[PDB]
Amino acid sequence: PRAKTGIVRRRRHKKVLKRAKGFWGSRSKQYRNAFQTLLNAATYEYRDRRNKKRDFRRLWIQRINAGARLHGMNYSTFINGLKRANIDLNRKVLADIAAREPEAFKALVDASRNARQ
Amino acid sequence: HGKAGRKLNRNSSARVALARAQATALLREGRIQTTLTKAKELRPFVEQLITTAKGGDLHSRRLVAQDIHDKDVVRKVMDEVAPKYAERPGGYTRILRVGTRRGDGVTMALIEL
Amino acid sequence: FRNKKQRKQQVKLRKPGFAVAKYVRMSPRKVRLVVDVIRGKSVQDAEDLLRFIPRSASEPVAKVLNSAKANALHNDEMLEDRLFVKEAYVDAGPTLKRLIPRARGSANIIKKRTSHITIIVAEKGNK
Amino acid sequence: KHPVPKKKTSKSKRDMRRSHHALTAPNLTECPQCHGKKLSHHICPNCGYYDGRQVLA
RNA sequence: AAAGGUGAAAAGAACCCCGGGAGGGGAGUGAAAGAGAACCUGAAACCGUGGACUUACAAGCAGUCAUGGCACCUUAUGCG
RNA sequence: GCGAGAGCUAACUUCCGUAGCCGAGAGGGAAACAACCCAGACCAUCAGCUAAGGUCCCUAAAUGAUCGCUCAGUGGUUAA
RNA sequence: GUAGGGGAGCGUUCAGUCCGCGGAGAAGCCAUACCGGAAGGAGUGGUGGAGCCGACUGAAGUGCGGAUGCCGGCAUGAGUAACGAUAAAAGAAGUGAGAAUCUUCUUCGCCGUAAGGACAAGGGUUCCUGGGGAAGGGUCGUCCGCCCAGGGAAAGUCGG
Ligand SMILES: [Mg+2]
Ligand SMILES: [Mg+2]
Ligand SMILES: [Mg+2]
Ligand SMILES: [Mg+2]
Ligand SMILES: [Mg+2]
Ligand SMILES: [Mg+2]
Ligand SMILES: [Mg+2]
Ligand SMILES: [Mg+2]
Ligand SMILES: [Mg+2]
Ligand SMILES: [Mg+2]
Ligand SMILES: [Mg+2]
Ligand SMILES: [Mg+2]
Ligand SMILES: [Mg+2]
Ligand SMILES: [Mg+2]
Ligand SMILES: [Mg+2]
Ligand SMILES: [Mg+2]
Ligand SMILES: [Mg+2]
Ligand SMILES: [Mg+2]
Ligand SMILES: [Mg+2]
Ligand SMILES: [Mg+2]
Ligand SMILES: [Mg+2]
Ligand SMILES: [Mg+2]
Ligand SMILES: [Mg+2]
Ligand SMILES: [Mg+2]
Ligand SMILES: [Mg+2]
Ligand SMILES: [Mg+2]
Ligand SMILES: [Mg+2]
Ligand SMILES: [Mg+2]
Ligand SMILES: [Mg+2]
Ligand SMILES: [Mg+2]
Ligand SMILES: [Mg+2]
Ligand SMILES: [Mg+2]
Ligand SMILES: [Mg+2]
Ligand SMILES: [Mg+2]
Ligand SMILES: [Mg+2]
């Protein structure tokens, strides 16, 4: 017996192509360039899962430093200050305190510069 | 660049045989239909030729006869029309824009006395 | 309605103010150049502009315009003094193909394309 | 010799190029007599009027 | 060399509308003309019309991640 | 890199010995950069500590401390 | 983790058997935010108009992006080059649904040991009449060496 392709190739193809909507020009309409674009997309996805974990830490840190310095303290000195007084806060959380709740962040500042004295 | 006249994608002899044929024709029948341009280019050659024929002497006939090679038309422009234009300081003709043709897209036009 | 077949019996589709010239031996992009002037415009206007547009295509398109008019008036009892070109477009017919010789032995293929002109008339009140 | 294009031109490009092929619709006036339409400084092709009446019928 | 397919049955569309015609819109037949003779399905490339959000200080393998704006609500008011 | 020959104690040179890496190695650093420095990625996380390398702004992190040096932009490429 | 070795599977036709669907609508096609560790798999809806899914087992012409691969369709270059001798055209008139291109008239221009006339070779109805206009004509055609029909070719002495 013989077994043509029948139906499989087009299903594969549409699969790729349908992953690829919103891609510019032929990248979203031609199979091969879709499939290709997608390989590179692979790289970018995996990488950036790790990397976004890298990025958000960064952000938190920025905000923290800011709040720190509003009340006359560097960030680094603020964080040894916190570790000294064994306050054990996430910097995600430290950021959110710093940004959202003024007086509270203030209190943590005073506690930390005390731990520094 | 103050030069004057139209090349009309033709050689000097052609250019001449043109203005002569179309002069002969306009004078043979009071009004003709032709490219708007060829009209523009015809008006002052014919108007002048009229002013020549407006002399009436034999010189002015022989003159006209060089440009207009058909006896009957010469005789017409000498004896019939020039004498009519008698009192008009030139402007012996006028031009009308009919408009676009089918084959080649060209604004035709009408020229008459 | 319960069945597709049921609908296919009960309704019958209508093409209200619509005519189509199929297989016009012209090129779409050309014909479009003309059509884009006609479109949105109030049928009378279209009738005129088509008489003073100096493309060839202008003529087949004139003809479809009139066919859609005579379909909105007759087969649809619509109101002339309220008709406008609701939509119009050109798509590609089966394109004629012919060999043409070239220099040395080479040959080539001219595509005498073809065209489907479509106009759709429709009444316009503002309210 | 024999230049040739390096790369297919995108549908997008090609069409950006075409941004100027818009035909210009006639400015059209309505004949002061027989009433259809005409071009400025041309003879009204319906009647034949240009003030009195020049082209024929 | 390429070449295949109306419909169960030709009942193959009388007649009316625009057009020289081509083509089409009706009507009538048919279960269906979402089968009309360029007639089974009719994918993709490719060409267009319309609508959503968008773009005229911009350096780009066109993705990917994060967030904000708008829009939308049939495995859909959230993980969207 | 270290050990030699060949070579001009030239070569991103050639031919051997030896360790490591690339090859078949992603991740951080060295602006960029197979090889160098840190380091071997089973997957998920908007969690914590570190390595080399860094903490004026682009750019995460002391415009840190104390005792000096250089004033030449040396810093930010060579010699008698 | 490259060559390579090993392991467990996904999907495709055909085949046997079991289950079983299908005009209150099959396969195929189309959309989709659901499912599975992946090949993949279902739900619903639109299409279509007569066949087909699931399970176990068997056999393969069994899975594609590459091969300046093969066949086919359609893009780009692009409304670009070009429209095939620089011998040349103008008006009127007619026709016609439509004419710069067809017909008539008047001229103009170009060949004239030729671009005129008559044979041969070759071609094969291309000749004449009447009609036609899809394509062929490098535009357009109402015209044609194109399409349809009907006519036309006569030898004791020319050639065999
Ligand atoms: Mg980390
Ligand atoms: Mg020219
Ligand atoms: Mg018909
Ligand atoms: Mg019925
Ligand atoms: Mg749009
Ligand atoms: Mg600026
Ligand atoms: Mg802007
Ligand atoms: Mg070497
Ligand atoms: Mg590496
Ligand atoms: Mg690296
Ligand atoms: Mg870097
Ligand atoms: Mg290197
Ligand atoms: Mg350190
Ligand atoms: Mg900083
Ligand atoms: Mg492995
Ligand atoms: Mg079976
Ligand atoms: Mg089957
Ligand atoms: Mg291929
Ligand atoms: Mg090639
Ligand atoms: Mg090919
Ligand atoms: Mg152009
Ligand atoms: Mg060009
Ligand atoms: Mg050019
Ligand atoms: Mg040119
Ligand atoms: Mg020619
Ligand atoms: Mg010429
Ligand atoms: Mg008539
Ligand atoms: Mg000619
Ligand atoms: Mg006559
Ligand atoms: Mg001869
Ligand atoms: Mg014979
Ligand atoms: Mg033609
Ligand atoms: Mg006729
Ligand atoms: Mg003949
Ligand atoms: Mg005899």
Task: Say how many domains are in chain A.
Answer: 1
Q: Residue B87 class from Cβ within 10 Å (0-12 exposed, 13-18 middle, 19+ buried)?
A: exposed
- Number of Cβ within 10 Å of residue B102's Cβ equals 10
**What is the Å distance from ligand 2's center to B9 Cα?**
7
C110 forms beta bridges with C98
Q: Which residues contact C64 (CB under 8 A, 6 or more apart)?
A: C19, C20, C21, C117, C118, C119
> How determined?
X-ray
- The answer to whether the beta carbons of residues D33 and D46 sit under 8 Å apart is no
Domain range B1-113, CATH architecture? Alpha-Beta Complex (3.90)
Three-class DSSP category at A101: coil
- B106: the nucleotide nearest its CA (via C1') is G100
Chains A and C touch (3+ CB pairs under 8 A): no
- Sign of CA pseudo-dihedral D14, D19, D20, D21: positive
| Alpha carbon distance A62, A68 (integer Å) | 10
CA to C1' distance (Å), from A31 to E44: 10
CA of A100 to the centre of ligand 18 (A): 59
Q: Using an 8 Å Cβ cutoff, are C90 and C115 in contact? A: yes
Q: Quick one: tokens of B54?
A: 């407006």
State the nucleotide closest to A96 in CA–C1' terms: F46
The answer to whether the Cβ–Cβ distance between C34 and D26 falls below 8 Å is: no
Domain residue spans of chain D: 4-57
Q: Token pair 């959380």 is at which residue?
A: A93
Contacts of D10 in chain A (CB under 8 A): 25
| Strand G nucleotides within a 7 Å radius of protein CB atoms | 11-14, 24-25, 28-32, 39-41, 47-49, 59-66, 74-79, 84, 86, 88-92, 98-101, 106-109, 134-140
Close Cβ partners of B30 (under 8 Å, ≥ 6 residues apart): B112, B113
Chain-centre distance for alpha carbon A107:
29
Which burial class, exposed, middle or buried, applies to D31 when counting CB atoms under 10 A from its CB (0-12, 13-18, 19+)?
Answer: middle
- Residue B2 corresponds to which tokens in the numbers above? 């103050």
In whole angstroms, what is the distance from residue C75 CA to residue C52 CA? 29
H helices, E strands: number in chain A: 5, 0
CB contact under 8 A, C36 and D22: yes
Q: Do chains A and B touch, with touching meaning 3 or more CB–CB pairs less than 8 Å apart?
A: no
Question: A31-70 and A102-116 are packed helices; what angle lies between their axes, rounded to 10 degrees?
Answer: 70
Sign of the Cα pseudo-torsion (B78, B79, B85, B87, in order): positive
Strand partners, C109: C99
Q: Is D47 annotated as a binding residue?
A: yes
Q: In B, which residues are within 8 Å of C54 by CB distance?
A: 100, 105
Determine the residue of chain B that is closest to D41 in CA distance.
B97
Q: Which residue has the tokens 């002569």?
A: B20
Q: CATH for C1-127?
A: 3.90.470.10
Q: Could you tell me the distance in Å between the CA of residue C88 and the C1' of nucleotide G68? A: 45
- Domain positions in chain C are 1-127
Q: Give residue limits of the domains in chain B.
A: 1-113
Contact D25 C48 (CB under 8 A): no
Of D39, D41, D54, the CB nearest to B110: D54
Contact B108, B101 (CB under 8 A): yes
Show which positions of strand E are touched by protein (CB under 7 A).
Answer: 16-19, 21-27, 30-34, 38, 43-50, 61-66
B94 touches chain D (CB under 8 A): no
Dihedral sign of CA atoms B110, B68, B74, B62 in order: positive
Closest CA to C120 of C88, C90, C91, C89: C88
